[PDB]
Amino acid sequence: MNELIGVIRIRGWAATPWYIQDTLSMLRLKNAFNAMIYPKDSSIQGMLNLVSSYVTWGELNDEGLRLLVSKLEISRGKKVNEEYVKDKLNVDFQSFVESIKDGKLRLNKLDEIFSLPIRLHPPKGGFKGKVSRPFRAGGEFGYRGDKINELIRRM
Amino acid sequence: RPGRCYRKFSGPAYTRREYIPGIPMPKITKFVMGNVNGDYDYELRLITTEKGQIRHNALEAARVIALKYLSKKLASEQNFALVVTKYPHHVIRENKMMAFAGADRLQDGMRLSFGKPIGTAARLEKLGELVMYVRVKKEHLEAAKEALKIASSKLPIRTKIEIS
Amino acid sequence: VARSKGYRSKTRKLLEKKVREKGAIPKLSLLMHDYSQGEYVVVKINPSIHKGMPHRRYHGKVGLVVGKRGKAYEVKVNIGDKERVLIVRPEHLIPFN
RNA sequence: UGCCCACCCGGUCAUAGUGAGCGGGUAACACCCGGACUCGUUUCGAACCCGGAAGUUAAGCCGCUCACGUCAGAGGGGCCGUGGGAUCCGAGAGGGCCCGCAGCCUCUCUGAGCUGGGAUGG
RNA sequence: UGGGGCGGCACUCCCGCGAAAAGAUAACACGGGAGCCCAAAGGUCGGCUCAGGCGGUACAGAACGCCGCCGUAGAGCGCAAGGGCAAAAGCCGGCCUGACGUGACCCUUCCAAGUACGGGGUCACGACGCGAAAGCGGGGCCUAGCGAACGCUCGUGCCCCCACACGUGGGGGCCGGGCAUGACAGAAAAGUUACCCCGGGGAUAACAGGGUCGUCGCGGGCGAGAGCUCACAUCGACCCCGCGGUUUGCUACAUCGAUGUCGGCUCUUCCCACCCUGGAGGUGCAGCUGCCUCCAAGGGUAGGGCUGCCCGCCCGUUAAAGGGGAG
RNA sequence: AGGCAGCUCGCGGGGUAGAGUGACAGAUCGGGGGCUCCAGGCGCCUGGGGCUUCCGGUCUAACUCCGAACCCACGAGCGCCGAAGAAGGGGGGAGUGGGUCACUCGGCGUAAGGUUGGGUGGCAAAAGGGGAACAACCCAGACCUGGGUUAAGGCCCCAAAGUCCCGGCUAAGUGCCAACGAAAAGGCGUCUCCAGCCUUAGACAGCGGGAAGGUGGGCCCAGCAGCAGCCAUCCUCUAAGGAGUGCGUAACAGCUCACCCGCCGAGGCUGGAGGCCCUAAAGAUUGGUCGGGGCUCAAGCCGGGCGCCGAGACCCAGGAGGGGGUCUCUACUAGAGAUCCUCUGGUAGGGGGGCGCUGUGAUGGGGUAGAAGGUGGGUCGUGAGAUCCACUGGACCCGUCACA
RNA sequence: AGGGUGUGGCUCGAAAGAAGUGAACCCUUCCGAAGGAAAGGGGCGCAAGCCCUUAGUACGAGGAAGGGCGAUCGGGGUCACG
């Protein structure tokens, strides 16, 4: 049981049922191909089992985690007074962490907890590189485990 | 009326006799033929492979033809035991008013469309239910497959024959 | 045909009693506790006690005790977004948790 | 001492029940002896009520064994459902797969009274 | 309101099911009820145990009374249905009238989310009944048995009557009961029109098109039997599986500021499920004539009597005088 | 200064699918034992009826001794929103009360693009990309312009991208169909998996012979000399045979039914299920079909794989507007700016700003014999519109502020 | 069938639009967002193909500088083809 998972919304928000759309707003996945990092516990698991047909998730390792945090852009950094400030350096981390987070005074000490809506790109090489359907049970949606790390590298 | 009308399920089970007045008597009256308790070797069975309903007309014709064939081979009380298992509990009903009351400007059309009982049927709610079996000795195994094949021709549901 | 809306309509099985609970009130140890204000209770209708009996729509709900009038209690329950106050005899209550 | 065994008042309300057979009391619990008086039987001191004390372990009560009942655990057998998914299969009835959960009956074996508050005995 | 009409009442109220194990939920859906009855069938206190069966007793019998054994309810509880009830909520007795005056709150009708009546529940003050007592009792074991404004009338203590004051008769007022609207959240109400008229409606019928195929027409399986014997030359019961869209129904999608609505005549074309003409085979095929199966739509299929017809019956012939579609 | 559209844990509610029937109420098919009456036959036997007992079997919308998945109440935690966008309170203006289809769980119905309910989603009020065309199905929510990567779907030509790769099947032009067009039955036609039984101690098929005798026994019969009306059942025997089929025949007879020999020398036979295909399989609104061409180790079907193309979706650059926070200037019913964050389909409808026409009070105010109007053409503005140029025309007309 | 767009042909162009203080068109260098190769070399698979290096290189919307030639462009009408 790894301690940190990443979830990606792989479908758009048109004609999505009442129950499902509200759960994905609490997980911060409003539209397609934005990702979010959460700790693995029984409370989040029951949420993913409800919206399973719209997301894919699994356990991050060092290469997948390091790669998600680097992708931030001008409207994609963490809530540095909102503004989603693109990190790109420790300069934003030498003055922002002094409010809620602790022990993070260097980009190499940003490994612990939380994030914001990470906006991604569709996957290189065809989301149908080996599949034909993001709509099929486990054909492309649902839990995939350690395989979530090579999918992040593509996007 | 064609059997395609009353072969599929349309609604719940309709069996309670105390709330249903005027049900016609079924065509089947004898369900066990031959000499049960005789000494037999083979116990071959007729098994359905679908879900549906069997009218009491189909169930009585499949029984007369099978009994006549076996009785034609050797004898009646002799070594065979013919048993039809299902009873026609369900009651099938027809909106007959299209015949009479649908043309007096009486409750014609679909107005007051609950139907009146016309006969009974046997609901088959599981896959692979026993419908008939026959018990014979080893010398009669062949005349017993043919009796069940001829009977299977007068029944709405697709069936098999199993030997044991 | 639309349904008759009597007080005990569509209660053929909600107001059943199982074979080992029948008879004039069996459990007296629940009646030896005096609920105080701020306690939590569960509205459980007893089909054989016909006095101070709540409505079918409140069976199995959790209320909060807010007062007492005679031998019966004032219980505040939520139905949808509305607060409702009931006066229930203690034979139709069990403590919660 | 002791602890548990009856008794009085209980809680749980068959794992605690019902029948049959047996075991046990110099106290306690009972049957038991009798009716002037309080009270009493649409007749009966049977019952209720009052006053007693010779007799007994035969009843009740408590414990033990055996039959059935009941609640569980294990094993053999019969039957079988379902929330989500797909430009899955099939003419349809229905069925298979992926992620998530189970249930009912019948046989066989093994156990089966726990417990709170107070005056007699060991 | 599966067009309207005729019928019924799904027009007020109650129970079960429909109803998918919270709540809500429709049908001219299914199975039925109420519009009252009771001075006890109401209140309380005490005693008792019911239906059914077994053993013993004169008349005595399955079923009278008596003596015993068993009996979880298999009875009874005014009335539908459902629920509840055993030292009772049932049966039998004693004493009673709480089926009480005044004044509140809450539930249901009416989910969340507005809402009249009706019904029910919990109480305060005053007074009773029954119990040794704790206490139980504002009807019936629980869910049905009911009705606005204005007007009249009764009960109950006072308030008012005038361009001034006082008095008598008479009127009016506040609070509660009764007189009724069942079309039951309340108008005081018969037909007819083919002599008819207006505003509309394809929200809605008739012809015609669409969907469906019970009915209608045709095909296949099986094989009870009959055919001297022989199921399949020919016929083919009881059942089962389909097809067509040429009948009649079902639905109400299109057309209501219009798609001229039967039959006939005239003229054109198409389908094949073959009546004749062409090819092949079987036969209970000697020949002639028959009967049946398969291919095949190139050609043909006419004249009259009767009826508005269509269908149909009939006359004299014919190789045959097939059957359908095109709004 | 809290809120709940979602989940988890804790603590509770429920009688549905299923399952049972000796747990209640109804239905419902057979057998064994015991008791009784009636009828028949010679105390017995057989049949019918009623009661009891035991064993097995079939059912229920208005049955339940039981009982899931699932849904729901409350508490805590998580998650999200919130002092910039704000639980509870007050106020102004509406529109709506004809819905419809797909998927899914039902009631009525032979069904229906039928009718009537529960849940979700489109359309209504939703463009664009696919489905030949298509309100409703699949992808997906369009502020404007450019670049990229994908989804649904597709890749022989029409038509962007595969005459792509491996293992098999089909011979009918079957097929080239998600929603859309075929059943029971028949086929060893061919392809595949399971059973069982015979095989070098010579299988299956075939071929020559033995292919049979007492006897063609027989009962009944002129005779059925298997096979016309009932039927037994014995060895001269061993490398060989049964007391024995269908034909038939007035009757025969005979071929064939069954067992051995001789040959031969490799596997054979009978059931079960599956794939594809064939028959079943017949119409016309008139004239050929997968959209068409056409396609046969496929451009079809089955089990798999690889790479590409392809939306306004998602990413990127530039631009525009709305809202909000923070600031500057101005005799301000309003203008002009700087900066940071976020949002962008729309009918009924509610709200904010602006353009244009005719007249009135003013005015830094103006213009004119060269005005207004007309025709064609430049430029500015998202736009309603403004303004200019050339020609025509012959006397009136405009900018700004406020009002009607 | 009819309008909008892309590429071309022929025509009108005095003014009100840009322009000799330089229209239009050609060369060179530089920066470059999201994205992003191939040839060559090595390895794996029956095969279509894939993996490491080449390499985040060549390129890539936009943007900035210089040189040459030098007088038309924007705009209007109409026709052909996608």
UniProtKB/Swiss-Prot annotation, chain A:
Q: Which InterPro entries match?
A: Ribo_uL30_ferredoxin-like_sf (IPR036919), Ribosomal_uL30 (IPR039699), Ribosomal_uL30_arc (IPR005997), Ribosomal_uL30_euk_arc (IPR035808), Ribosomal_uL30_ferredoxin-like (IPR016082)
Q: Which organism is it from?
A: Sulfolobus acidocaldarius (strain ATCC 33909 / DSM 639 / JCM 8929 / NBRC 15157 / NCIMB 11770)
Query: Keyword annotations for this protein?
Result: Ribonucleoprotein, Ribosomal protein
What's any one GO cellular component for it?
cytosolic large ribosomal subunit
Recorded GO molecular functions are: RNA binding; structural constituent of ribosome
HAMAP family per the record? Ribosomal_uL30_A
Q: Any idea what this protein is called? A: Large ribosomal subunit protein uL30
Its assembly, as annotated, is:
Part of the 50S ribosomal subunit.
Database matches in Pfam families: Ribosomal_L30
Q: Which Gene Ontology BP annotations are present? A: maturation of LSU-rRNA from tricistronic rRNA transcript (SSU-rRNA, 5.8S rRNA, LSU-rRNA); translation
CDD domains associated with the record: Ribosomal_L7_archeal_euk (cd01657)
Question: Which ranges of the sequence are coiled-coil?
Answer: none
Would I find GTP-binding among this entry's keywords?
A: no
Family per record = Belongs to the universal ribosomal protein uL30 family.
Swiss-Prot record, chain B:
Q: Which InterPro entries match?
A: Ribosomal_uL16, Ribosomal_uL16_arc, Ribosomal_uL16_CS_euk_arc, Ribosomal_uL16_dom, Ribosomal_uL16_euk_arch, Ribosomal_uL16_sf
- State the Gene Ontology terms under molecular function: structural constituent of ribosome
Q: Which CDD domains match?
A: Ribosomal_L16_L10e
Question: Which Cys-Cys disulfides exist here?
Answer: none
Q: Which GO BP terms apply?
A: translation
Keywords assigned: Ribonucleoprotein, Ribosomal protein
Has the keyword Ribosomal protein been applied to this entry?
yes
Q: What Gene Ontology cellular-component terms does the record carry?
A: ribonucleoprotein complex; ribosome
Q: Which HAMAP family match?
A: Ribosomal_uL16_arch (MF_00448)
Q: Which family does it belong to?
A: Belongs to the universal ribosomal protein uL16 family.
The protein's name is Large ribosomal subunit protein uL16
Q: State the species of origin.
A: Sulfolobus acidocaldarius (strain ATCC 33909 / DSM 639 / JCM 8929 / NBRC 15157 / NCIMB 11770)
Swiss-Prot record, chain C:
GO terms for biological process, alphabetical? translation
Any Pfam family matching the protein: Ribosomal_L21e
* InterPro entries attached to this UniProt entry: Ribosomal_eL21, Ribosomal_eL21_arc, Ribosomal_eL21_CS, Ribosomal_eL21_sf, Translation_prot_SH3-like_sf
Instruction: List UniProt keywords, sorted A-Z.
Output: Ribonucleoprotein, Ribosomal protein
A single GO cellular-component term on record = ribosome
Q: Name one GO molecular function term.
A: structural constituent of ribosome
- Name the domain of life this protein comes from: Archaea
Task: Please give the PANTHER family that the UniProt record associates with this protein.
Answer: 60S RIBOSOMAL PROTEIN L21
Family that this chain belongs to: Belongs to the eukaryotic ribosomal protein eL21 family.
Q: What is this protein called?
A: Large ribosomal subunit protein eL21
Q: Which organism is it from?
A: Sulfolobus acidocaldarius (strain ATCC 33909 / DSM 639 / JCM 8929 / NBRC 15157 / NCIMB 11770)
